[PDB]
Coordinates of C-alpha atoms and ligand atoms in Angstrom, one line a residue:
Chain F
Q210 CA -0.2 0.0 0.1
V211 CA 0.9 3.7 -0.4
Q212 CA 3.2 4.7 2.6
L213 CA 4.3 8.4 2.9
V214 CA 7.3 8.8 5.1
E215 CA 8.6 12.2 6.2
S216 CA 11.8 13.1 8.0
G217 CA 14.2 16.0 8.4
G218 CA 12.4 17.7 11.2
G219 CA 13.6 19.3 14.4
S220 CA 14.5 22.3 16.2
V221 CA 16.5 25.3 14.7
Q222 CA 16.7 29.0 15.6
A223 CA 15.0 31.9 14.0
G224 CA 16.7 33.0 10.8
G225 CA 17.9 29.3 10.5
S226 CA 16.9 26.7 7.9
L227 CA 16.2 22.9 7.6
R228 CA 15.1 20.6 4.9
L229 CA 12.2 18.3 5.3
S230 CA 11.9 15.0 2.9
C231 CA 9.0 12.8 2.0
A232 CA 9.6 9.2 0.8
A233 CA 6.8 7.6 -1.3
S234 CA 6.1 3.7 -1.5
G235 CA 3.6 2.3 -3.9
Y236 CA 3.1 5.6 -5.4
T237 CA 4.8 7.8 -7.6
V238 CA 5.3 11.4 -6.6
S239 CA 5.8 12.5 -10.4
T240 CA 2.3 11.3 -11.8
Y241 CA 0.2 13.1 -9.4
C242 CA -0.1 16.3 -7.8
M243 CA 1.4 16.5 -4.0
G244 CA 2.0 19.0 -1.3
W245 CA 2.5 20.0 2.3
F246 CA 0.5 21.5 5.1
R247 CA 1.1 21.9 8.6
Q248 CA -0.9 21.6 11.9
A249 CA 0.1 24.5 14.3
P250 CA -1.2 23.9 17.9
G251 CA -4.4 26.2 18.5
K252 CA -4.4 27.0 14.8
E253 CA -6.1 25.2 12.0
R254 CA -4.5 23.2 9.1
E255 CA -2.6 25.6 6.8
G256 CA -1.5 24.9 3.4
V257 CA 2.2 25.3 2.8
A258 CA 3.2 24.3 -0.8
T259 CA 2.3 22.0 -3.6
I260 CA 3.8 20.5 -6.8
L261 CA 3.1 18.8 -9.8
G262 CA 6.0 18.5 -11.9
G263 CA 7.2 21.9 -13.3
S264 CA 4.3 23.7 -11.7
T265 CA 4.9 24.8 -7.9
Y266 CA 2.7 26.8 -5.7
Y267 CA 3.3 28.3 -2.4
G268 CA 1.2 29.5 0.6
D269 CA 0.9 33.3 0.9
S270 CA 3.0 33.2 3.9
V271 CA 5.9 30.5 3.3
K272 CA 5.9 32.2 -0.4
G273 CA 9.4 33.3 -1.0
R274 CA 11.2 31.6 1.8
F275 CA 10.1 27.9 1.2
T276 CA 10.5 25.8 -1.7
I277 CA 9.0 22.3 -2.8
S278 CA 10.6 19.8 -5.1
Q279 CA 10.7 16.2 -6.3
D280 CA 13.6 13.8 -7.0
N281 CA 11.3 11.2 -8.9
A282 CA 14.6 9.4 -9.5
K283 CA 14.3 8.5 -5.9
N284 CA 10.5 9.2 -5.4
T285 CA 10.9 12.0 -2.8
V286 CA 9.5 15.3 -2.4
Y287 CA 11.5 17.6 -0.6
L288 CA 10.6 20.8 1.4
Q289 CA 13.4 23.3 1.8
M290 CA 12.6 25.8 4.6
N291 CA 14.7 28.8 4.7
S292 CA 14.9 31.9 7.2
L293 CA 12.4 30.1 9.6
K294 CA 10.4 32.4 11.9
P295 CA 9.2 31.2 15.3
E296 CA 5.7 31.1 13.7
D297 CA 6.5 28.3 11.7
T298 CA 6.9 25.9 14.6
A299 CA 4.4 23.3 13.9
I300 CA 4.0 19.7 12.5
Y301 CA 4.4 19.5 8.8
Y302 CA 2.7 16.8 6.8
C303 CA 3.2 15.3 3.5
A304 CA 0.4 14.7 1.2
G305 CA -0.1 13.0 -2.3
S306 CA -3.4 13.0 -4.2
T307 CA -4.7 11.1 -7.1
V308 CA -5.6 14.2 -9.1
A309 CA -3.2 15.2 -12.1
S310 CA -4.0 18.9 -12.4
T311 CA -2.0 22.1 -12.2
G312 CA -5.4 23.9 -11.5
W313 CA -6.6 21.4 -9.0
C314 CA -3.0 21.7 -7.5
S315 CA -3.2 25.5 -7.3
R316 CA -6.0 25.1 -4.6
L317 CA -3.3 24.5 -2.3
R318 CA -5.3 22.2 0.1
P319 CA -2.9 19.2 0.6
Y320 CA -5.0 18.5 4.0
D321 CA -7.6 17.1 1.7
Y322 CA -5.2 14.9 -0.4
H323 CA -6.1 11.1 0.1
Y324 CA -2.8 9.6 0.9
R325 CA -1.1 11.5 4.0
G326 CA 1.9 11.0 6.2
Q327 CA 2.4 11.2 9.9
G328 CA 4.1 14.6 9.8
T329 CA 7.3 15.7 11.4
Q330 CA 7.7 18.2 14.6
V331 CA 9.4 21.3 13.5
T332 CA 10.1 23.8 16.4
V333 CA 11.7 27.1 15.7
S334 CA 13.5 28.9 18.8
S335 CA 14.0 32.6 19.1
Chain K
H190 CA -37.0 16.0 -32.3
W191 CA -36.6 14.9 -28.7
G192 CA -36.3 17.5 -25.9
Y193 CA -36.8 18.5 -22.4
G194 CA -40.1 20.4 -23.3
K195 CA -43.7 19.2 -22.5
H196 CA -44.4 17.2 -25.8
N197 CA -41.0 15.8 -26.3
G198 CA -39.8 15.6 -22.9
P199 CA -38.1 12.9 -20.8
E200 CA -41.3 11.1 -20.8
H201 CA -42.5 10.6 -24.3
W202 CA -38.6 9.3 -24.8
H203 CA -39.7 5.6 -24.5
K204 CA -41.6 6.2 -27.4
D205 CA -38.8 6.8 -30.1
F206 CA -36.2 5.2 -27.8
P207 CA -37.9 2.2 -26.2
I208 CA -34.6 1.4 -24.2
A209 CA -35.4 4.1 -22.0
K210 CA -37.1 1.4 -20.0
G211 CA -34.1 -0.8 -19.6
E212 CA -32.8 -2.1 -16.4
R213 CA -29.7 0.0 -16.1
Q214 CA -31.0 3.5 -16.7
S215 CA -29.7 6.9 -15.2
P216 CA -30.1 9.3 -13.4
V217 CA -31.4 7.5 -10.3
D218 CA -31.8 8.5 -6.6
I219 CA -29.0 7.2 -4.3
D220 CA -30.3 6.1 -1.0
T221 CA -27.4 6.9 1.4
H222 CA -28.8 4.1 3.6
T223 CA -28.4 1.7 0.8
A224 CA -25.0 2.2 -0.4
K225 CA -23.0 -1.0 0.2
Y226 CA -19.3 -0.5 0.8
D227 CA -16.8 -2.7 -1.6
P228 CA -13.2 -3.3 -0.7
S229 CA -12.3 -3.8 -4.2
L230 CA -12.8 -0.1 -5.0
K231 CA -9.8 2.1 -5.3
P232 CA -9.6 5.8 -5.2
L233 CA -10.6 7.8 -8.2
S234 CA -7.7 8.2 -10.8
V235 CA -8.3 11.5 -12.3
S236 CA -5.1 12.0 -14.8
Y237 CA -6.0 15.1 -16.3
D238 CA -2.4 16.3 -16.7
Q239 CA -2.2 16.9 -20.6
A240 CA -5.9 17.8 -21.1
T241 CA -6.4 19.8 -23.8
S242 CA -9.8 21.6 -24.4
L243 CA -10.6 22.7 -28.1
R244 CA -14.0 24.1 -28.5
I245 CA -17.1 25.0 -26.4
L246 CA -20.3 23.9 -28.6
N247 CA -24.0 24.1 -28.3
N248 CA -25.6 20.9 -29.4
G249 CA -29.3 21.5 -28.8
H250 CA -29.8 20.3 -25.3
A251 CA -26.8 21.7 -23.5
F252 CA -23.1 22.9 -24.4
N253 CA -20.4 20.7 -24.7
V254 CA -16.9 21.5 -24.2
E255 CA -15.1 19.3 -26.8
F256 CA -11.5 17.8 -25.6
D257 CA -8.9 16.2 -27.8
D258 CA -8.9 12.4 -27.3
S259 CA -6.4 11.5 -30.1
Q260 CA -4.3 9.9 -27.4
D261 CA -4.3 9.4 -23.5
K262 CA -3.9 13.0 -22.9
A263 CA -6.6 13.1 -19.9
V264 CA -7.4 9.7 -18.6
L265 CA -9.5 8.2 -15.9
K266 CA -8.4 5.0 -14.5
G267 CA -8.4 3.6 -10.8
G268 CA -11.7 4.0 -9.2
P269 CA -14.2 1.3 -9.8
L270 CA -13.2 1.2 -13.4
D271 CA -11.3 -1.5 -14.9
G272 CA -9.2 -0.1 -17.7
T273 CA -8.3 3.5 -19.0
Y274 CA -11.0 5.9 -20.2
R275 CA -10.0 8.9 -22.1
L276 CA -12.0 12.4 -21.5
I277 CA -13.9 13.3 -24.6
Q278 CA -16.1 16.3 -23.3
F279 CA -18.1 17.7 -20.4
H280 CA -21.3 19.4 -20.3
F281 CA -24.0 20.4 -17.9
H282 CA -27.7 19.8 -16.8
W283 CA -29.7 22.5 -14.9
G284 CA -33.2 23.4 -14.2
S285 CA -35.6 26.3 -14.4
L286 CA -35.3 27.0 -10.7
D287 CA -32.4 26.9 -8.0
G288 CA -34.4 24.6 -6.3
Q289 CA -34.0 21.8 -8.8
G290 CA -31.6 21.0 -11.8
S291 CA -29.2 18.2 -11.2
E292 CA -30.1 14.8 -12.6
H293 CA -28.8 12.4 -9.7
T294 CA -30.4 12.8 -6.4
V295 CA -29.1 12.2 -3.0
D296 CA -31.9 10.8 -0.7
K297 CA -34.3 12.6 -3.1
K298 CA -32.2 15.7 -2.5
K299 CA -31.9 17.9 -5.6
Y300 CA -29.0 20.3 -6.5
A301 CA -28.9 23.3 -8.6
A302 CA -27.1 21.5 -11.6
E303 CA -25.0 18.6 -12.5
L304 CA -21.7 18.5 -14.2
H305 CA -20.7 15.4 -16.4
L306 CA -17.4 14.5 -17.7
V307 CA -17.7 11.7 -20.3
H308 CA -14.7 9.2 -21.1
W309 CA -14.9 6.3 -23.2
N310 CA -12.8 3.0 -22.9
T311 CA -9.6 3.0 -24.9
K312 CA -10.0 -0.7 -25.5
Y313 CA -12.9 0.2 -27.8
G314 CA -10.9 2.1 -30.6
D315 CA -13.0 5.0 -30.8
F316 CA -15.8 6.8 -28.7
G317 CA -18.5 5.5 -31.2
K318 CA -17.7 1.9 -30.7
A319 CA -17.0 2.5 -27.1
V320 CA -20.6 3.6 -26.4
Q321 CA -21.9 0.2 -27.6
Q322 CA -20.3 -1.8 -24.9
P323 CA -21.6 -2.2 -21.3
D324 CA -18.3 -0.9 -20.1
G325 CA -17.3 1.3 -23.0
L326 CA -18.2 4.5 -21.1
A327 CA -17.3 6.1 -17.7
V328 CA -19.1 9.3 -16.7
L329 CA -18.1 11.5 -13.7
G330 CA -20.8 13.3 -12.2
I331 CA -20.2 16.5 -10.3
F332 CA -22.9 18.4 -8.2
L333 CA -22.9 22.1 -8.6
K334 CA -24.8 23.5 -5.3
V335 CA -25.8 27.1 -5.0
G336 CA -23.5 29.2 -2.9
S337 CA -20.6 31.4 -3.9
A338 CA -19.3 32.2 -7.4
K339 CA -17.3 29.6 -9.0
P340 CA -14.1 31.4 -10.7
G341 CA -13.5 27.8 -12.4
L342 CA -16.9 27.8 -13.9
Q343 CA -17.3 31.5 -14.9
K344 CA -14.6 31.0 -17.3
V345 CA -17.1 28.8 -19.2
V346 CA -20.3 30.8 -18.5
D347 CA -18.5 33.9 -19.4
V348 CA -18.2 32.8 -23.1
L349 CA -21.9 31.1 -23.6
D350 CA -22.7 34.4 -25.4
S351 CA -20.7 32.9 -28.3
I352 CA -23.1 30.0 -28.5
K353 CA -26.4 31.4 -27.9
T354 CA -28.1 29.4 -30.6
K355 CA -27.7 25.7 -31.8
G356 CA -24.9 24.9 -34.0
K357 CA -22.9 27.9 -32.9
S358 CA -19.3 27.1 -31.6
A359 CA -16.7 29.0 -30.1
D360 CA -12.8 27.9 -29.5
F361 CA -12.6 27.3 -25.9
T362 CA -8.9 26.5 -25.4
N363 CA -6.8 25.6 -22.6
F364 CA -9.0 24.4 -20.0
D365 CA -8.4 22.2 -16.9
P366 CA -11.1 19.9 -16.6
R367 CA -9.8 19.9 -13.2
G368 CA -10.8 23.5 -12.3
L369 CA -14.2 22.0 -11.9
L370 CA -13.7 18.8 -9.7
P371 CA -14.3 19.1 -6.1
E372 CA -11.3 18.7 -3.6
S373 CA -12.4 15.6 -1.6
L374 CA -13.1 12.7 -4.3
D375 CA -15.3 10.4 -2.4
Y376 CA -17.8 8.7 -4.8
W377 CA -20.8 6.5 -5.2
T378 CA -21.1 4.3 -8.5
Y379 CA -23.2 2.0 -10.4
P380 CA -24.1 0.7 -13.8
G381 CA -26.3 2.9 -15.7
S382 CA -26.9 4.5 -19.2
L383 CA -26.7 8.1 -20.8
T384 CA -29.3 10.4 -19.4
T385 CA -30.2 11.5 -23.0
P386 CA -31.0 10.0 -26.4
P387 CA -30.0 7.4 -27.5
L388 CA -29.9 6.4 -23.6
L389 CA -27.5 3.4 -24.5
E390 CA -26.8 1.3 -21.2
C391 CA -23.3 1.5 -21.1
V392 CA -22.1 4.2 -19.0
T393 CA -20.4 2.9 -15.6
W394 CA -21.3 6.2 -13.4
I395 CA -19.4 7.8 -10.9
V396 CA -20.9 10.5 -8.8
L397 CA -19.0 12.8 -6.6
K398 CA -20.1 13.1 -2.9
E399 CA -18.9 16.6 -2.2
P400 CA -20.4 19.4 -4.7
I401 CA -18.6 22.4 -6.2
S402 CA -20.2 25.7 -5.6
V403 CA -22.2 27.9 -7.9
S404 CA -23.5 31.4 -7.2
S405 CA -27.3 32.0 -7.5
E406 CA -26.2 34.8 -10.0
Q407 CA -24.2 32.2 -12.0
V408 CA -26.5 29.1 -12.8
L409 CA -28.8 32.1 -13.7
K410 CA -26.7 32.4 -17.0
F411 CA -27.0 28.8 -17.8
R412 CA -30.7 29.1 -18.6
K413 CA -29.5 31.8 -21.1
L414 CA -28.8 29.4 -24.1
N415 CA -31.4 28.7 -26.7
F416 CA -32.6 25.1 -27.7
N417 CA -33.4 26.0 -31.3
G418 CA -31.0 27.4 -33.9
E419 CA -30.7 30.9 -35.1
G420 CA -33.4 32.0 -37.5
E421 CA -36.1 29.6 -35.8
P422 CA -38.2 31.1 -33.0
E423 CA -36.5 31.9 -29.7
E424 CA -36.4 29.1 -27.5
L425 CA -34.8 29.2 -24.3
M426 CA -32.9 26.3 -22.6
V427 CA -34.2 26.8 -19.2
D428 CA -34.4 23.2 -17.8
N429 CA -32.6 20.3 -19.2
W430 CA -32.5 17.5 -16.7
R431 CA -33.7 13.7 -16.7
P432 CA -35.7 12.7 -13.6
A433 CA -34.6 9.7 -11.3
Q434 CA -34.9 6.3 -12.8
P435 CA -35.8 3.2 -11.2
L436 CA -32.7 1.4 -9.6
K437 CA -34.7 -1.6 -10.3
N438 CA -32.0 -4.7 -9.1
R439 CA -28.4 -3.0 -9.3
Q440 CA -27.0 -1.4 -6.4
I441 CA -24.7 1.6 -5.4
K442 CA -21.4 1.0 -4.1
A443 CA -19.2 3.7 -2.5
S444 CA -15.7 4.7 -1.8
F445 CA -16.3 4.9 2.0
Ligands
LIG794 ZN1 -25.0 14.2 -19.1

């Protein structure tokens, strides 16, 4: 079955940066549209970024300092986070839907995508 | 010939098209408390990556948005289907009122309108042959429920002006059949037929649980098209949906 494993989380200071990764199994990160979303405590599910090959879309906030990409050669969609803010502290999840669409992908709602991962704690100290 | 009027409406259809009384006819009322779950069902696979729209078109009972199907550009697999169906065109069904309009119904519940994405099975060579087999077709239904404007839809209704009468056609190019799909793709499914002449019983219907929104102001433009062709007495396309049919034997499976 489709397993979706994330990794690379942790604790970093504001201004810092780390890179989360997502490994697929029984799924091909290239054919469909995938993405990340985070569940901060107290706050509701927020969409971070999505990708469908050449087209990548970013959440109004993380836009400009976050980056998504895939290494289909090893089925792994990475999420490069740069210049983290404390606000970013949260759990980041990896999602992978079954819809092949840029438009449908630009909605930026990985929290509705069928195949989900367990997420990884990402804390940002000040 | 046939139409959604009073003297040629969905009832008098069984007259010229006797198959309108077959055992697998659509639409139908889906009894949510009758849907049987099935572990053989997989998530719907909507591979609309290279979907290439070519032209919107008024055909006489709705308006179709033709897509290129020369190859597997936009395909439907997974789901309850067993093969690979190519998207050929999509059109809508609406009613004279906002209270009614969709063909399928959830617990006798009606929606403002219904979007249908028609795909034929690639194992049958062409759509024509395809629609002759008990599995040659796969139609994806999407409920349009009144509410907020639909940026996606508007890019469609926006051009209807170019096809007020029958026969008229405008080049509707580059369009994500996806802009139209809901976000959560749970679905009901059953063996049915086309909800309009020839009413062939070959569509393997797939209806989506979650609906997409439409403003009361928008579905209002739908009923602006004309049934008739230019020159003939002005005829408005105010209502064009078929009533729920006898589920007879069959049974509705679901992806949940
Ligand atoms: Zn239809």
